[PDB]
């Protein structure tokens, strides 16, 4: 089985290995399409506490192709990690970060406590706001919040806050306060064609064989020998006359090689009249002597 | 398709118990295979998995404490598992996973064998 | 995901028709497998993805659901579907988990 060369990898090491992640309040997204979901990185990072998926379990999501996968970027406390979910409720569920209740993706994070620490209020969620977020939705406004019946005017004040409150990130907190790394990644099928499917390793390519054969998307059979043909550069094989595969070009090595039947040929018993002689010789008619 | 599971027996409180299960009947390198176990008064409770890829996935009470793998060159899934406390006695399985599309469900089980712990 | 059978036994004569429900905590959309038990045996498959039946499994056994009430049905009870019933979420992966489970016997 021959497969091109795996080149143009999924980001997952630029979302998970990043320098720096986004408040809650305002989390990242980053589009992964037209790309190979290699997820080795995320088979046994060691560093990641928290794993569980929603959509499809992760020994497949490893294969099965996908339209778009969408990488969603954000630190939260150890103890808002449970909100990072379907059918949840919270601050950060309610006003921060909600999934959908049917929503299909992986939720993967771990602690952060020696990268996202020091005070660090660098990292800020929101505390205030009106109704609840939509899934998806990702509320940036800093507008005061009017808890009471008194206009605000745009500042603080009796009954006024300033929505969006930060974290006291120090190394020396306790677990449930330490600060923690969450990507979500929502992975969704749409009648489009799918781009991102998982990688799959070449066997070994072994010409004068015969060997039962798929390149690509092609199902073949035969022998392979070195090709005299020079192909356009777009076309991946060739045909014969009566709907046959006639050369095939590599997805690896860009080389072509002709297609020859496995060899095959009638046998016939060469043999004197047994009243004389029961010494017989044996033709293997159209055949090579290396096959027999 | 056939499962086989071995290594069950008594062992201490703080001690550690090693299963095997026998695989036969279908390419065991090709399948996502699982542990569960069967506590009375609980009911049948989820342990390990192991995937085709080497990657393996605990519940948070075991994560530590038990270690899966597979040797797919013998066809034979084992479970190590150390830190054994009395909560561990059950009945443990070993199972084949798979698939339809985006629904994944268990399909094989052994017949079990039980792990007692006690003093 | 938490899962809650009911009954948690069920009386049914053979030839009835055998109802067995299962409730999830939350929407777990029609990621449902359905087991049957029979004593000193390993379980079966049933049902798998809410209402696909296995391979295998008697024409009998049926059953649909989606969100958070699914129900398993048995059109006719044979005296070999002795034997305790269990629901299992697959919409939340690694952590596979089934419900109490229905014991269902044979009324008399």
């Known amino acids: 089985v021959r497969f091109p060369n795996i080149t143009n990898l999924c980001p997952f090491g630029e979302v998970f290995n990043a320098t720096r992640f986004a408040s809650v309040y305002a989390w990242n997204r980053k589009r992964i399409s037209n790309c190979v979901a290699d997820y080795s990185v995320l088979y046994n990072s060691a560093s990641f506490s928290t794993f569980k998926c929603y959509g499809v379990s992760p020994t497949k999501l490893n294969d099965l192709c996908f339209t778009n996968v969408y990488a969603d970027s954000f630190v939260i406390r150890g103890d808002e990690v449970r909100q990072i979910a379907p059918g949840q409720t919270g601050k950060i569920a309610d006003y921060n970060y909600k999934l959908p209740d049917d929503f299909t993706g992986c939720v993967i994070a771990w602690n952060s406590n020696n990268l996202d620490s020091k005070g660090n209020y660098n990292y800020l969620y929101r505390l205030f706001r009106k109704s609840n977020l939509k899934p998806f939705e990702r509320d940036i406004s800093t507008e005061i919040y009017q808890a009471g019946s008194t206009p605000c005017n745009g500042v603080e004040g009796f009954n006024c806050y300033f929505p969006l409150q930060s974290y006291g990130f120090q190394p020396t907190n306790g677990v449930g306060y330490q600060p923690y790394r969450v990507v979500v990644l929502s992975f969704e099928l749409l009648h489009a064609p799918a781009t991102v499917c998982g990688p799959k390793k070449s066997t070994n390519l072994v010409k004068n064989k015969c060997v039962n054969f798929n390149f690509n998307g092609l199902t073949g059979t035969g022998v392979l020998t070195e090709s005299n043909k020079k192909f356009l550069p777009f076309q991946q094989f060739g045909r014969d006359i009566a709907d046959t595969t006639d050369a095939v070009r590599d997805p690896q090595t860009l080389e072509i090689l002709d297609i020859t039947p496995c060899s095959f040929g009638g046998v016939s018993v060469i043999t004197p009249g047994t009243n004389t002689s029961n010494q017989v010789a044996v033709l293997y008619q159209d055949v090579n002597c290396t096959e027999v | 398709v056939q499962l086989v599971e071995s290594g069950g027996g008594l062992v201490q409180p703080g001690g550690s118990l090693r299963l095997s299960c026998a695989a036969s009947?279908?390419?065991?390198?090709?399948?996502?295979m699982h542990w569960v176990r069967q506590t009375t008064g609980k009911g049948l409770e989820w342990v390990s998995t192991?995937?085709?890829?080497?990657?393996?996935y605990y519940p948070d009470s075991v994560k530590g404490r038990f270690t899966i793998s597979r040797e797919d060159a013998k066809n034979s899934l084992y479970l190590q598992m150390n830190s054994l406390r009395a909560g561990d006695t059950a009945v443990y399985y070993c199972?084949?996973?798979?698939?339809?599309?985006?629904?994944?469900?268990?399909?094989?089980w052994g017949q079990g064998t039980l792990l007692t712990v006690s003093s | 995901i938490e899962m809650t059978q009911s009954p948690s036994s069920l009386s049914a004569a053979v030839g009835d028709r055998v109802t067995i429900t299962c409730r999830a905590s939350?929407?777990?959309?029609?990621?449902l497998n359905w087991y049957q038990q029979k004593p000193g045996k390993a379980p079966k498959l049933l049902i798998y993805?809410?209402?696909s039946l296995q391979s295998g499994v008697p024409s009998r056994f049926s059953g649909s659901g989606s969100g958070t009430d699914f129900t398993l049905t048995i059109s006719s009870l044979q005296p070999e579907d002795f034997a305790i019933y269990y629901c299992?979420?697959?919409?939340?992966?690694?952590?596979?988990?089934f419900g109490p489970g229905t014991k269902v016997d044979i009324k008399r």
């Open positions: 192991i995937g085709t890829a080497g990657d393996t």
């Open positions: 009947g279908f390419t065991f390198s090709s399948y996502d």
């Open positions: 993805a809410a209402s």
């Open positions: 939350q929407s777990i959309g029609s990621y």
């Open positions: 299992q979420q697959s919409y939340v992966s690694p952590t596979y988990t």
């Open positions: 199972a084949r996973g798979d698939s339809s599309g985006y629904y994944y469900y268990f399909d094989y």
